[PDB]
Design a protein around this nucleic acid. Structure first.
Ligand code: MG
Lengths: 582, 181, 124, 205, 264, 283, 283
DNA sequence: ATGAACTTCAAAAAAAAAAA
């Protein structure tokens, strides 16, 4: 199902007119297309480049498929009419001649044996007269932009004769048919059966085709080539007898999705997501749709793309799915492709890890809270960072919190450590440090990494007995009383006592609570002083002694307890109510 | 009530734009705005464009922010959109919700940015509040007909042989223009 | 949340100060500077400093208590606390530093829980 | 028919396609299912035949990259030195599997004298209830043990209760017909699961 | 060759180290993603048995053939020779490039992914090196550092299940001497395979079950459930093997089983 | 090439400072979060041994695979310009270079070294392997907010009145860290770890905190090095049977430990005389 | 540079004042909480030694890497405007900058300095490493609430004319802090820290409290500086087997101390003379 | 001749909230 779900959208995108390589071809990224006249005579070396900031090498021309050269005598293979600045010009940037001239001795051979088998084309007779020139090819090096194709190793030049103007020599409706004939005769006399993917006879394809976009080089996604990965003496592709017509389909299915908008990194794991076979598009809804509705394979991938993007957008919505999205989360090994994810499941089922991420991360917010309901990871991790989210450690943090969030894994200790660092370093617990600590501690509980404690809740737990959480609440009420006593404070007992009330409660809370009677005295509403003192009595009723030192477990609680109680105090009528029910 | 727009008059008076006539006039205006295209279709988003303006909370914000009978920034676009998606049709409802929930936040995506799928699913409480406002005092129950059978006409009066998908966005923006205009 | 038999001198002094201020704040409830507002800072740290003066000051609050039996109520728990206080410590230990605030608010809760003192007195 | 109930913490019925980067077949392969039933009992008279797998725990995956070795062992070179022949095969393993393989068997051409189907049937029956085996059954890979049992009818809850995923063309049971003694020249027959209605029935060739 | 079926419950532990890191995730100890319990792929155990037998034997009949470059530096007549002069080929089996079953020698000793008893808490210890290796991107002016990463399990009592099959020993010639070497390995291999990544590991018990039958007179599951390993009564988080009750249960196996408590 | 196998219990302690701060946690001392027990990585004590051998030995045959300007390939390639430049046929040139460092770099003899980096120079296991030392009791990391009365950069706030960069100086008020160590004969054979190179390591463990001091770690001391020398290059006894043999418990009734005086290191030299030797080097 | 390694016990007390306020804890003195014993960061005494050297030396080769308007990158960039502007080849440009910052700044030559910051000046460890100063007995931080008859910005000015901002003055009614310190020779070689700079440091330790007085310090003194000068660059004896020679206890019958006359500082120079000197510089 | 050693292959890949 890993590949029959790729074959079964090649057969969908090839039938949704989405423009996928048709049965013999490949959307190869040809950077430095060659222009020739009708009888040779190199005209121009156009570069079909200029895309995303790393100038990806060429407009994807859907040219005859890359033949997977890959060998010591790699020169013999010679892709049909597009290959290489070493195959087209015999120019070796770093490979040396006789490893580029023998390439050109075979690329010219390939073109010519095409020309004999495909005459009166004026496109291949042109290039076959351009590949029997040795001078116009020399003129290719003396081109205006040749110096920029020599810069890109493995440049793929291809032969657009002039007077076709978009259509390559390998695009004419004879080379197009030749490839549709050279992938229907030569790749049909091979090992007769039987398909792994489709199950049909469909002659077996040894050498699956170089799935591009995963690795540093197009690597054969399914490729058993070492002395023992071969199971039954099957030798490299008969270990997995996938037909040529099916091998091509899923290879060019990955190739487009790793080159399309389907590709997106879940985290450090480039993933191709495509909608499964959509339901028959119930009649009423299909009444308005013309055709009617078509199963565009990559249609609602956004639902899943904007699910993992929701972890950074903070725009997570609990989804109701039943629209199943294939999500093949491949990743490079070295030059194999490691399927790290495979999910035919719905986006609702995929969300169960981000939902648990944004439910373990749920934290109290008052009214008109400037904080998002589900707080974006970059803005969430920005509460761990020095002052702006780029220095949060790209290996135990932003790159691992995401893996701990995308997968409902345990948030690393490096959050308590980092979130606590910032709690007592910014001298305040931003929503985002309280929320992130709530997520850490909830998952530490759920993993049995935080044994005695019970999972935190959104709200303040006017309970919880936790010698760190209740002192966090105590600090929250103490600082609320101070900020209620002195509205404009320059050094709240946060900014002055937090670093040691969080981590060392006897050092401080024995002296915060001498400031406390004075703060209560200064409350202009003495009844408000009574209410706040009542709740600090309630808070401190759960406390039997300020601990000498708060474990890393509880300084997270302190921060969570602080934020819980401080958003309880800044609730509409919470303290007035809770006081009035006593 | 309900106070669609609270204009502090130049004479230090306050005039109230009745949401009744605000929605009525917007729908009538973006019924001529669309020709054979969405004449009675864009109005059904004109009727609904500020349904969330019926919010009991927003009728406490538009007063607070515009100084009518003496700061929260209460969303109101999404409520009309959710009302549409539940009442007309999963197709027409979302069609109309693009227009409605975008009418101030800008036209929204379904998934990626400012996603409607998120806002509608989160509009349930907001729609409940705004529809409670709508039913609470005034606005006869057949003020929002949302007659899908009639609304099916100008859709099919324009989409002869069904709705082209690759250019259904052009209404979603042209009829959006009718609403926002 | 009150260990009436804690014996932690900081905690018993916190309890004692809580009842002392309870009496002061029942002696005259309209009070600008209760002993929390004027004495707590050292009662929590230097119990010998105040707690001597806090009990010069205590019988007069017990007199000023309007409900003459309420004075017995609160004096009884002062004695209940002071059984656990063999001496007002010169300087409260740091553990005891914090436990004094613990005691203040534990015993303050115990006093402002409705029937607790009037009940617990009647089991003596 | 035997309703043996393979189960194990992990399992890798490695898809032929994703062999170097092992991705387990979502359920027990009828080859791996059968060879398990040869691990408990086999003889070149019994020829096992899986009649119906039944998934008993949901298809749950855990990726495990093991530093596998790249090359076979050989008489020629008398050692590997793994750090020279290292490979890192990922393994999308099947965590917490269970499968009640409803399997029976037939008698081969070389059934011998004591060709009693009942003899081998009761032999396997005693082996499975007692727990005996020639080989601790491999859930696709020997690194994964089959904590089996010989159920009579049904003693575990199959999770794919309503009609569930069709895993497509899985390796059925590699064809050792052209092979000489000890499976030299084989081929792979493969099967539409048929679906997984709640426990997949397999197809006898 | 041995004539008994051995199903053993190895119980090693890691006290401050990385038992078996994950190439998935850098080098962090293989956790079970859903339950947090650590995994130690049997090939790691199969390695330290291999390593031990390579350290100790240093002779013919006991080579390893999958040997470490960093620890020591007709058709059924060479496959028997491989199952003769290579202890690993006998013990753990082989895939001989020439063979009968397209290569395999299965070898008696099957092994289980050593799942930890309780959720290990992989401690991502970001370590530093006061030196860069290459002419780094930032092997710059101020100092050469290559801030690194070294994980530990603060303790994990990993439980492995091995299944020595006397049926395979007959093909491989895995004699009772070789199997005694195997127990010596499991017990005495975390004393010899020490490292920086692997911290301190200790074979905290190798509870073999010898079966009077070749075929094996028990379900291996039932035997392993006789070796009940639990966190102790008051142990909140495990940190040493004396935080585990390894209660073996020999009460009912006594029919024809032998619980050789070879390591505990 | 030592001929015995050693299993030592090193017990050092930290008085006031970061025994080994966690770069993941500012510079918080590595705490095992579950138990609060401190951790001092393998590499920390290996580095402190390295520093001790950069201090006291300072010659060829005891280089250290070294300090700041330590482009490690500059040493790894330095191997390949040796007696093994071209006659050692890369296959075994790697091993020859690996042996060159196991002749030259005391760190690479004692501990290992991943040297496969530059011109691949082998990959040594290291006869001496320390384990992450856990403090016997939870370290009560104090996390002092120090102040600096001088800003470093032209800060966003390096403003008018004062320039200040407060910062954090985490300290362990006391932690008795118990490193376990394994000096395996088998890898002492491939690296040439000599009995001399082993007495150097014993000296290093005993004296390497007296010499590796800092503002960060303050005072650390080696509080005892109980070495179990086994008669065979195998193990006479299981290592942990010998490490539980050295049991360190907080003193009878100290609720929080302030010094070694609040710990009790009781060794059990009663039954190891099987053939083993407990040689007590610090305790 | 120095050719002996020193381990000094620097007993300094505070009589009525805040020896080192914990910014994490209001300003109340740093305290080892679970033992109540006070703390004075190593950076605090390094600061007062810096203040002393900035006070007395007033000359180049003894600058201090300095007071408030002390943007450190400014001094570091001064290092890169030297003989090593270009001539030192960025790799060792930072090392030449270290040698400079060590030459000029006695702070850097004596204590270290993290100067990797601006035009990177390297990273000096600093031969002199004071530890944290844990008071012998629990400091009974008094936290004297004080008053001011004045306020600050007319936002906290009273709604009546009576302005006052009482505030708090934490004082240790007495604490005999004990700072272990280590003059490491190996890093004296790095910084050029000489016996002249070391005698400056000893004067600084003895006289660093006579000069750094605050309303906060009240009265701090240097009750003793017992310097263990080892014969070797290495340590003749383990550092803590020396520091246990300076046993400071509260005297016979003091419930808790109130002056140095309440502490007996017993110095045990009986057998340290193995090869090694104890010089009672301060006491 | 089989299997390690080696030689070619190919030339990455990049994001991320408002609020009507
Ligand atoms: Mg509007």
């Amino acid at each position: 199902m890993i590949l029959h779900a790729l074959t079964q959208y090649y057969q969908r995108k090839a039938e949704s007119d989405g423009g996928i390589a048709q049965e013999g071809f490949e959307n190869k990224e040809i950077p430095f297309i060659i222009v020739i006249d009708k009888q040779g005579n190199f005209i121009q070396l156009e570069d079909t480049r200029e895309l995303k900031v790393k100038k990806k090498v060429g407009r994807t021309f859907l040219v005859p498929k890359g033949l997977g050269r890959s060998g010591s005598k790699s020169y013999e293979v010679s892709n049909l009419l597009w290959d290489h600045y070493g195959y087209v010009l015999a120019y070796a940037g770093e490979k040396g001649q006789e490893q580029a001239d023998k390439q050109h001795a075979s690329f010219t051979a390939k073109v010519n044996e095409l020309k004999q088998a495909l005459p009166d084309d004026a496109g291949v007779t042109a290039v076959a007269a351009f590949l029997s020139s040795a001078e116009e090819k020399s003129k290719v090096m003396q081109a205006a932009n040749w110096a920029e194709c020599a810069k890109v190793k493995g440049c793929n030049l291809s032969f657009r004769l002039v007077d076709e103007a978009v259509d390559l020599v390998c695009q004419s409706k004879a080379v197009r048919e030749y490839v549709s004939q050279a992938n229907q005769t030569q790749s049909d006399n091979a090992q007769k059966g039987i398909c792994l993917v489709t199950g049909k006879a469909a002659p077996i394809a040894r050498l699956h085709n170089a799935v591009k976009g995963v690795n540093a080089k197009p690597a054969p996604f399914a490729s058993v080539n070492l002395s023992a990965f071969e199971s039954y003496g099957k030798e490299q592709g008969f270990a997995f007898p996938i037909g040529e017509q099916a091998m091509f389909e899923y290879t060019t299915a990955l190739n487009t999705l790793l080159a399309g908008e389907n590709r997106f990194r879940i985290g450090d794991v480039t993933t191709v997501c495509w909608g499964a076979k959509r339901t028959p598009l119930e009649e009423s809804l299909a009444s308005m749709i013309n055709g009617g509705g078509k199963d565009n394979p990559d249609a609602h991938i956004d639902a899943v793309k904007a699910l993992y993007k929701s972890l950074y957008n903070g725009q997570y919505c609990k989804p109701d799915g039943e629209d199943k999205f294939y999500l093949l989360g491949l990743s490079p090994n070295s030059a194999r492709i490691v399927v790290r994810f495979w999910h035919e499941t719905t986006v609702a089922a995929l969300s169960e890890s981000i939902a648990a991420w944004y439910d373990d991360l749920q934290m109290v917010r008052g009214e008109n809270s400037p904080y998002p309901e589900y707080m974006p990871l970059p803005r969430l991790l920005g509460n761990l960072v020095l002052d702006g989210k780029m220095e949060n450690l790209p290996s135990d943090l932003i790159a691992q919190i995401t893996d701990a969030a995308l997968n409902n894994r345990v948030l690393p200790v490096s959050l308590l450590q980092a979130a606590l660092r910032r709690n007592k370093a910014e001298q305040k617990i931003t929503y985002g440090r309280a929320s992130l600590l709530k997520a850490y501690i909830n998952r530490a509980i759920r993993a049995g990494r935080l044994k005695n404690m019970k999972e935190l809740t959104m709200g303040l737990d006017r309970n919880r007995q936790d010698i760190g959480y209740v002192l966090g609440r105590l600090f929250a009420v103490l600082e609320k009383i101070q900020a209620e006593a002195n509205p404009g404070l320059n050094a709240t007992i946060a900014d002055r006592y937090f670093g040691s009330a969080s981590s060392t409660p006897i050092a401080v809370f024995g002296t915060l609570m001498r400031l406390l009677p004075h703060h209560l005295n200064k409350l202009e509403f003495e009844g408000r002083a009574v209410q706040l003192q009542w709740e600090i009595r309630q808070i401190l009723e759960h406390c039997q002694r300020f601990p000498n030192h708060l474990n890393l477990e509880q300084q997270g609680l302190f921060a969570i307890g602080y934020y819980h109680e401080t958003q309880f105090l800044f609730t509409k009528d919470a303290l007035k109510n809770l006081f009035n029910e006593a | 009530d309900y106070i669609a727009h609270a204009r502090q008059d130049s004479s230090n008076a306050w005039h109230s734009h009745p949401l009744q006539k605000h929605l009525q006039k917007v729908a009538q205006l973006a019924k001529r705005f669309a020709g054979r295209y969405g004449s009675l279709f864009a109005e059904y988003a004109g009727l609904l464009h500020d349904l969330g303006k019926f919010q009991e909370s927003f009728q406490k914000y538009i007063r607070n922010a515009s100084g009518f009978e003496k700061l929260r920034k209460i969303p109101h676009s999404t409520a009309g959109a959710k009302y549409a998606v539940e009442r007309l049709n999963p197709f027409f409802g979302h069609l109309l919700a693009y227009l409605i929930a975008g009418h101030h936040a800008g036209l929204a995506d379904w998934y990626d940015k400012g996603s409607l799928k998120r806002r509608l699913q989160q509009a349930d409480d907001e729609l409940a509040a705004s529809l409670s406002g709508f039913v609470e005092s005034s606005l006869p129950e057949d003020f929002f007909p949302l007659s899908d059978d009639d609304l099916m006409r100008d859709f099919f009066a324009f989409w002869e042989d069904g709705a082209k998908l690759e250019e259904l966005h052009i209404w979603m923006r042209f009829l959006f223009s009718c609403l926002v205009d | 949340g009150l260990d009436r038999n804690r014996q932690d001198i900081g905690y018993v002094l916190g309890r004692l100060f809580a009842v002392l201020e309870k009496i002061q704040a029942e002696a005259n409830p309209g009070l600008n500077a209760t002993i929390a507002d004027r004495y707590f800072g050292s009662a929590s740290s230097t119990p010998i400093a105040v707690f001597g003066t806090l009990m010069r000051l205590l019988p007069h609050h017990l007199n000023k208590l309007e409900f003459e039996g309420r004075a017995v109520q609160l004096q009884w728990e002062i004695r209940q606390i002071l059984e656990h206080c063999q001496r007002f410590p010169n300087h409260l230990n740091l553990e005891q530093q914090g436990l004094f605030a613990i005691g203040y608010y534990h015993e303050t809760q115990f006093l402002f829980t409705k029937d607790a003192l009037k009940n617990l007195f009647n089991e003596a | 028919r035997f309703i043996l109930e393979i189960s194990g913490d992990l399992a890798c019925f490695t898809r032929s396609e994703l062999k170097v980067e092992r991705v387990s077949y979502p359920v027990i392969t009828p080859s791996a299912a059968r060879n398990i039933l040869m691990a408990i009992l086999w003889k070149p008279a019994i020829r096992w035949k899986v009649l119906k797998i039944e998934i008993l725990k949901p298809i749950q995956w855990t990726n495990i990259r093991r530093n596998e070795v790249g090359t076979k062992m050989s008489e020629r070179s008398g050692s590997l030195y793994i750090e020279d022949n290292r490979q890192q095969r990922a393994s999308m393993l099947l965590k917490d599997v269970a499968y009640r393989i409803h399997a029976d068997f037939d008698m081969t051409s070389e059934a011998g004298e004591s060709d009693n189907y009942v003899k081998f049937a009761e032999m396997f029956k005693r082996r499975a209830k007692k727990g005996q085996y020639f080989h601790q059954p491999y859930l696709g890979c020997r690194e994964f043990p089959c904590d089996f049992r010989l159920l009579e009818k049904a003693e575990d809850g199959l999770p794919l209760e309503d009609i569930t995923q069709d895993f497509g063309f899985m390796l059925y049971d590699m064809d050792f017909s052209k092979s000489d003694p000890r499976d030299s020249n084989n081929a792979e027959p493969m099967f539409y699961q048929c679906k997984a209605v709640n426990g997949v029935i397999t197809v006898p060739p | 060759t041995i004539e008994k079926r051995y199903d053993f419950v190895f119980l090693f532990d890691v006290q401050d180290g990385n038992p078996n890191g994950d190439p998935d995730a850098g080098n962090l100890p293989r956790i079970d993603p859903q339950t947090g319990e650590g995994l130690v792929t049997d090939v790691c155990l199969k390695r330290k048995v291999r390593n031990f037998i390579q350290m100790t034997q240093n002779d013919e009949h006991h080579d390893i053939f999958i040997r470490e470059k960093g620890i020591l530096n007709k058709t059924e007549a060479a496959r028997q020779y491989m199952c003769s002069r290579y202890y690993d080929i006998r013990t753990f089996g082989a895939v001989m490039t020439t063979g009968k079953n397209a290569g395999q020698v299965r070898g008696p000793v099957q092994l289980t992914f050593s799942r930890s008893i309780d959720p290990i808490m992989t401690l991502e210890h970001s370590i530093t090196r006061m030196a860069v290796t290459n002419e780094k991107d930032a092997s710059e002016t101020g100092d050469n550092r290559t801030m690194g990463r070294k994980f530990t399990v603060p303790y994990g009592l990993y439980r492995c299940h091995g299944f020595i099959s006397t049926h395979f020993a007959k093909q491989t010639g895995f004699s009772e001497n070789d199997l005694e070497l195997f127990w010596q390995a499991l017990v005495n291999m975390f004393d010899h395979d020490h490292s920086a990544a692997r911290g301190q590991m200790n074979a905290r018990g190798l509870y073999v079950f010898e079966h009077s039958n070749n075929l094996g007179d028990a379900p291996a599951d039932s035997l392993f459930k006789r070796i009940q390993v639990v966190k102790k009564d008051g142990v909140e988080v495990v940190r040493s093997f004396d935080d585990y009750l390894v209660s073996v249960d020999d009460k009912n196996l006594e029919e024809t089983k032998l619980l050789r408590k070879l390591g505990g």
